[PDB]
Ligand binder design. Structure first.
Ligand SMILES: [Xe]
Ligand SMILES: [Xe]
Length: 213
């Protein structure tokens, strides 16, 4: 089969170390050679990112410039019909073929309520789920009924991600960081230092552009 490809989505407002460092460690932990970040927008009916689509795309390219592991796909930022993880992954499966292992990266917090921002059954049909560990969190769904789904799909063997196309859920022992885009925005507006929270090229860019004012 082909080389595993992982997909990493989100709004990245802005991208920061809490998003990047855990994922970078996957190259070492499970032999992941490629991660494609697919940033998205937020539907009009929900709180909007403070930085726009082009600013958030640029900050991600700044953060990713010197990291060969990463590439960026700007489709969800160009699509007019609402974005859905399952919709992205279905297009990916189509574009890559059924012979390519595919994985979606998520945090251990989101895993627990996965069926809520669902299409879960469809996602595990199209790709694997690579879960970035949250020290101290349990592997127990918010909805006690989905515990079965979760337990049937889990794997303790990283090799399954490389030998099958989709269907598995693996908890990677990635480092974790107490950093959040929301607090960084607040600190930037409060004039507090964010030097230890995201890449210098992104922070410098933020200042040049006068973002998060
Ligand atoms: Xe994605
Ligand atoms: Xe990232």
């Amino acid at each position: 089969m082909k080389s595993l490809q992982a997909l990493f989505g989100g709004t990245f407002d802005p991208v920061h170390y809490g998003h990047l460092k855990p994922v970078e460690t996957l190259a070492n932990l499970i032999g992941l050679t490629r991660v494609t970040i697919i940033p998205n927008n937020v539907p009009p009916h929900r709180p909007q990112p403070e930085a726009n689509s082009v600013q958030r795309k640029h900050m991600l390219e700044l953060a990713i410039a010197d990291k060969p592991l990463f590439t960026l796909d700007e489709r969800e930022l160009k699509r007019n019909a609402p974005s859905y993880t399952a919709q992205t992954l279905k297009e990916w499966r189509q574009e890559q073929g059924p012979d390519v292992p595919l994985a979606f990266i998520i945090g251990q917090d989101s895993l627990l309520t996965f069926p809520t921002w669902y299409e879960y059954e469809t996602i595990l049909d199209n790709a694997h789920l690579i879960v970035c560990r949250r020290p101290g969190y349990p592997l127990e769904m918010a909805q006690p009924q989905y515990q079965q789904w979760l337990e049937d799909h889990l794997t303790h063997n990283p090799e399954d991600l490389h030998l099958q196309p989709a269907g598995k859920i693996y908890l990677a022992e990635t480092p974790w960081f107490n950093i959040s885009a929301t607090i960084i925005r607040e600190r930037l507006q409060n004039g507090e230092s964010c030097e230890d929270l995201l890449p210098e090229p992104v922070l410098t860019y933020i200042n040049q552009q006068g973002l998060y004012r």
